[PDB]
Write an enzyme that holds these catalytic residues in place. Structure first.
Site, short mmCIF file in Angstrom:
data_model
loop_
_atom_site.label_atom_id
_atom_site.label_comp_id
_atom_site.label_asym_id
_atom_site.label_seq_id
_atom_site.Cartn_x
_atom_site.Cartn_y
_atom_site.Cartn_z
N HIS A 1 0.83 -1.20 0.00
CA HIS A 1 0.00 0.00 0.00
C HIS A 1 0.86 1.25 0.00
O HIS A 1 0.60 2.19 -0.74
CB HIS A 1 -0.90 0.05 1.22
N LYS B 1 -16.21 -7.49 4.07
CA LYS B 1 -15.03 -7.90 4.82
C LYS B 1 -15.24 -7.79 6.33
O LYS B 1 -15.92 -6.87 6.79
CB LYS B 1 -13.81 -7.05 4.42
N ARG C 1 -2.09 -6.21 -8.00
CA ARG C 1 -1.12 -7.31 -7.95
C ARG C 1 -1.45 -8.38 -8.99
O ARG C 1 -0.58 -8.85 -9.72
CB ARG C 1 -1.09 -7.97 -6.57
N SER D 1 -2.87 -7.63 3.21
CA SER D 1 -3.22 -7.51 4.62
C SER D 1 -3.67 -8.85 5.21
O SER D 1 -3.18 -9.28 6.26
CB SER D 1 -4.32 -6.48 4.81
C1 LIG Z 1 -13.07 0.19 0.53
C2 LIG Z 1 -13.13 -0.31 -0.90
C3 LIG Z 1 -12.42 0.63 -1.82
C4 LIG Z 1 -12.47 -1.66 -0.97
O1 LIG Z 1 -11.16 -1.64 -0.54
P1 LIG Z 1 -10.37 -2.96 -0.26
O2 LIG Z 1 -10.94 -3.67 0.84
O3 LIG Z 1 -10.38 -3.73 -1.46
O4 LIG Z 1 -8.94 -2.44 0.13
P2 LIG Z 1 -7.61 -3.18 0.46
O5 LIG Z 1 -7.05 -2.58 1.61
O6 LIG Z 1 -7.76 -4.59 0.49
O7 LIG Z 1 -6.65 -2.81 -0.73
C5 LIG Z 1 -6.64 -1.50 -1.17
C6 LIG Z 1 -5.92 -1.38 -2.51
O8 LIG Z 1 -4.54 -1.67 -2.37
C7 LIG Z 1 -4.15 -2.52 -3.42
N1 LIG Z 1 -3.02 -3.34 -3.01
C8 LIG Z 1 -3.00 -4.22 -2.04
N2 LIG Z 1 -1.80 -4.76 -1.92
C9 LIG Z 1 -1.04 -4.23 -2.85
C10 LIG Z 1 0.32 -4.38 -3.29
N3 LIG Z 1 1.11 -5.25 -2.69
N4 LIG Z 1 0.72 -3.64 -4.29
C11 LIG Z 1 -0.07 -2.79 -4.90
N5 LIG Z 1 -1.33 -2.60 -4.56
C12 LIG Z 1 -1.85 -3.27 -3.56
C13 LIG Z 1 -5.37 -3.36 -3.64
O9 LIG Z 1 -5.37 -4.07 -4.85
C14 LIG Z 1 -6.45 -2.33 -3.56
O10 LIG Z 1 -6.53 -1.65 -4.78
C15 LIG Z 1 -14.55 -0.46 -1.38
O11 LIG Z 1 -15.12 -1.43 -0.56
C16 LIG Z 1 -15.34 0.82 -1.33
O12 LIG Z 1 -15.22 1.63 -2.17
N6 LIG Z 1 -16.16 0.95 -0.32
C17 LIG Z 1 -17.01 2.09 -0.17
C18 LIG Z 1 -18.45 1.89 -0.60
C19 LIG Z 1 -18.65 2.10 -2.09
O13 LIG Z 1 -18.39 3.12 -2.62
N7 LIG Z 1 -19.11 1.07 -2.75
C20 LIG Z 1 -19.24 1.08 -4.18
C21 LIG Z 1 -18.00 0.62 -4.89
S1 LIG Z 1 -18.23 0.58 -6.67
#
Ligand SMILES: CC(C)(COP(=O)(O)OP(=O)(O)OC[C@H]1O[C@@H](n2cnc3c(N)ncnc32)[C@H](O)[C@@H]1O)[C@@H](O)C(=O)NCCC(=O)NCCS
Ligand SMILES: CC(C)(COP(=O)(O)OP(=O)(O)OC[C@H]1O[C@@H](n2cnc3c(N)ncnc32)[C@H](O)[C@@H]1O)[C@@H](O)C(=O)NCCC(=O)NCCS
Ligand SMILES: CC(C)(COP(=O)(O)OP(=O)(O)OC[C@H]1O[C@@H](n2cnc3c(N)ncnc32)[C@H](O)[C@@H]1O)[C@@H](O)C(=O)NCCC(=O)NCCS
Ligand SMILES: CC(C)(COP(=O)(O)OP(=O)(O)OC[C@H]1O[C@@H](n2cnc3c(N)ncnc32)[C@H](O)[C@@H]1O)[C@@H](O)C(=O)NCCC(=O)NCCS
Ligand SMILES: CC(C)(COP(=O)(O)OP(=O)(O)OC[C@H]1O[C@@H](n2cnc3c(N)ncnc32)[C@H](O)[C@@H]1O)[C@@H](O)C(=O)NCCC(=O)NCCS
Ligand SMILES: CC(C)(COP(=O)(O)OP(=O)(O)OC[C@H]1O[C@@H](n2cnc3c(N)ncnc32)[C@H](O)[C@@H]1O)[C@@H](O)C(=O)NCCC(=O)NCCS
Lengths: 157, 160, 158, 158, 160, 157
Positions: C18, C42, C91, C128
């Site tokens: 991140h 989640k 990823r 995570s």
């Molecule tokens: C919170 C949201 C964005 C989801 O987040 P998510 O749980 O996927 O986040 P997470 O922490 O897992 O990862 C965040 C980002 O980091 C990226 N990432 C993770 N690890 C890595 C890595 N090693 N390298 C690069 N990128 C990474 C992920 O691919 C992701 O893009 C989504 O649920 C959301 O938008 N919620 C709000 C409600 C909403 O608007 N809903 C409609 C959506 S269309």
């Protein structure tokens, strides 16, 4: 005695390939690296040049040797009394390609294939892309063994 | 001399899994099937039930044995003096999932992972889908070892 | 004028993966806001305030970044702050499909655009969820997390 | 200060899909340069000067965009212009893997970063290669290309 | 009444293709197999050779016939008063490739496309890989219709 | 007489689903939309509510009818004298999921499955994501039939 063949074009061998060789050599009693022509290239390096670059980069793997192969891979494997191929996977594209060949090779000859996952550091490394970057003066020294870099500059210059 | 661990939930073991075991056992001097709990899955059978079904189904594999583990997979592997894991792949999703764990496991403990491709005939076989099909009375008898099939159908009829 | 983007996620906890994304976003946008949001699909470990704290500790050396939270639609979070861009990291092929779907939905409902960046090769396997799992069973994830986060992770577990 | 990005490609010819990417890049970067480069693994149809001309005609309404060509490494093209960002579009999983590999290679050799954007849903199936093929056999690709390009495509074919 | 076209290079037809034909023929009143040139492929057999091999291999399919076409697939389909295409899928790459063409074909002419999943046993079968394996003397006899196998091996021995 | 079943959760039906129904109805003599509970939800809408939303959105497809299904899908299909399932595909994730079920369904009962490609405009549309967006006040009216939008607001308000 267990054994596996690591086949490929290796044109040229990269640090990604070497990582596969090292892991294969750690698990099998003998490893034969087989340098074959892939049906759709002509290559930058001759088979003999490819073989030498591999031999120079694998001197520290005493149970590994290097050979040219012609014709059907599963014939090469069975002729040497082996029944295992070891390949490497970087990407989903690799997976689809290799899965097809692995199932075909097992179907036509009963030869099995084991895959190793790329090291994270070398996941984007391919011979083709390294050669392209080098052709336009890009520095690929961190992606290739030393036995390749000089030869590669020589072939480009 | 050479050895590999074949880990999984195996809940229950299928002919897809057994095919992997057989191919691993044909290449390595010893194979240990490791029945582990996946933290992210609900399970049907106890670990002891899973071990019984695999032991029942691997009698023709003399250099293979079946055990369980409670912690990290890499600890299970290294405590037995081994350094190789063997896993099977059916799909692109399997590949991504297994690649991630393989890299994590090599990073934290230096243990290597080898993958094999599914037998074409069993590519669509999973424990989850076989359990689901059997739950609704579908015929999964060609996808599971004989003993597994009996225990699964019996279990489902008890409705647990 | 100044450009800006939001880097949203669960960040539960924030990893070096991140952080790599945040650094690269902050290098190309004048203003970056890291948005801690709840993923309704989640089960979270850390609280939002804990997540924010860990990100803030880990991003001290990025002067043009701030950290906030939101409780509704991401696109409302973005537009409320006078922005129109989201930055996400990728990823895997699974990430790609998931993020593509959300990017097209978010553009459709609000006109907000999304930019993706590729993971650093060294952090391709870092998530995570998996770092938490490995840590739970005593594995060493110190090279995958900020020392700050590693301590707070090891703290709650042990 | 002003930010900037390069949008590189073969653009042989430019399609409405490419144009969508350019518009979205130009909305988020102060400066955009569309870079026409030769792909050493492709057989091209139009000349570089033709490609540049078609892009220029099609991007008249984007004031902060210019069009150039290059004959070596993309990363040299980018750095020579004092920039450090590339913007690419993604339709498919195949695009994702291809672009991911190049993005990591380009970062490795030059430190240049790459941002991807998702295709517009309406243009998901649009490629230069397929539009050329369909046009060659009399199919109507008018809704997939700028009218400018459609004319020049139909022109050479017929 | 209902009808579908099954288009392809079929260079040569494999048991994978035939499986698709059979399944299409079991659902639609008439099926036309369309042998077309793929602009992006080098071919081994002439179109007439390909038609012969398919006709030879589809004798048990009474409502199926085989023809060729020189232009757009959608023109071939609509000129026969049909509006459906049937294609098979083995892999994720097949899916992306076929999805793109399906959307293009629907966009330009309103013709619909239906996909079917490969039989698990033939998932790894392609014309290209079967030709390559046979070129080097490997046994592809279980992957091809009998007549195709004979003509392929004969062709290769002539070294063309 | 040819026929196919279009099974799903349809919770709720979207314009993406409707596009599948329309294309299925254009090629098969009869189409039965089967509303089943997917083993891992509980749903936002009852089966009866789902059925009504589909019926109201498909009035212009005279050869299509809608029914609840319980138990094994291939039993539902065979009991109605059919042997074809029609599903839709948006993504590679859909493809993997559906390919597995299609091969399983053919293996256990000989029932075949035909897939249609998503319309480009609806490729990102799912019931789950539409429901989530709507839950937080987002406008999904362009992604759903009219017979769904009011019901959806009612269930949220
Ligand atoms: C919170 C949201 C964005 C989801 O987040 P998510 O749980 O996927 O986040 P997470 O922490 O897992 O990862 C965040 C980002 O980091 C990226 N990432 C993770 N690890 C890595 C890595 N090693 N390298 C690069 N990128 C990474 C992920 O691919 C992701 O893009 C989504 O649920 C959301 O938008 N919620 C709000 C409600 C909403 O608007 N809903 C409609 C959506 S269309
Ligand atoms: C020569 C063969 C194996 C193809 O080799 P190919 O050209 O793909 O080899 P290449 O050098 O490109 O790669 C070699 C292997 O290294 C792997 N690899 C490359 N880079 C990396 C990396 N960074 N990390 C891990 N693995 C890697 C590749 O995925 C591949 O598995 C094939 O053409 C063959 O078998 N030919 C013989 C004829 C035959 O039998 N044909 C029938 C096949 S079913
Ligand atoms: C138990 C583990 C390995 C997960 O196992 P999982 O639930 O995925 O096993 P499952 O039974 O589902 O499958 C086992 C293996 O068989 C393969 N397989 C399944 N079906 C088939 C088939 N038909 N053909 C070939 N292979 C198959 C699977 O792809 C998998 O590789 C994992 O949770 C684990 O390692 N747990 C221990 C804690 C730990 O170490 N965590 C850190 C991991 S980085
Ligand atoms: C020229 C380069 C970038 C390749 O370009 P390519 O041929 O792939 O361009 P092409 O015109 O096909 O497409 C350009 C971009 O538009 C995207 N795109 C195409 N259609 C669409 C669409 N409908 N929607 C969104 N994006 C799209 C593509 O995915 C791609 O990202 C590459 O060959 C290159 O960098 N060459 C220079 C030499 C070099 O540096 N080599 C080393 C590379 S690591
Ligand atoms: C000829 C066309 C259809 C391309 O055919 P292609 O070369 O891909 O055919 P090929 O023989 O390789 O495969 C045919 C079909 O069988 C499928 N298939 C192959 N093997 C198997 C298997 N084992 N199981 C199931 N299906 C299979 C393929 O996935 C494909 O769907 C295309 O080039 C075309 O339409 N040309 C006409 C010009 C045109 O209309 N162009 C515009 C297209 S948008
Ligand atoms: C109910 C089943 C079919 C699962 O349905 P599911 O929940 O996946 O349906 P859902 O409503 O989500 O989607 C329905 C279909 O519409 C397709 N679809 C959705 N959106 C779109 C779109 N925009 N464009 C095209 N297609 C679409 C989906 O891909 C899917 O194919 C399955 O669980 C089942 O068969 N259950 C019965 C028990 C059984 O037989 N189990 C064994 C299975 S092998």
């Amino acid at each position: 005695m267990t054994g596996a063949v690591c086949p490929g074009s290796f044109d040229p061998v990269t640090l990604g390939h070497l990582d596969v060789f090292e892991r294969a050599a750690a698990q099998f009693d003998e490893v034969i690296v087989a340098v074959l022509i892939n049906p759709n290239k002509a290559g930058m390096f001759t088979v003999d040049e490819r073989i030498e670059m591999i031999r120079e980069s694998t001197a520290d793997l005493p149970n590994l040797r290097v050979e040219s192969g012609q014709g059907l891979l599963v014939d090469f494997v069975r002729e040497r009394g082996l029944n295992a191929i070891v390949k490497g996977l970087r990407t989903g594209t690799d997976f689809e390609y290799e899965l097809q060949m692995a199932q075909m090779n097992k179907h036509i000859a009963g030869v099995d294939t084991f895959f190793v996952a790329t090291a994270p550091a070398y996941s984007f490394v391919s011979s083709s892309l390294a050669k392209e970057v080098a052709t336009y003066g890009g520095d690929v020294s961190a992606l290739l063994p030393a036995s390749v870099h000089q030869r590669l500059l020589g072939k480009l210059r």
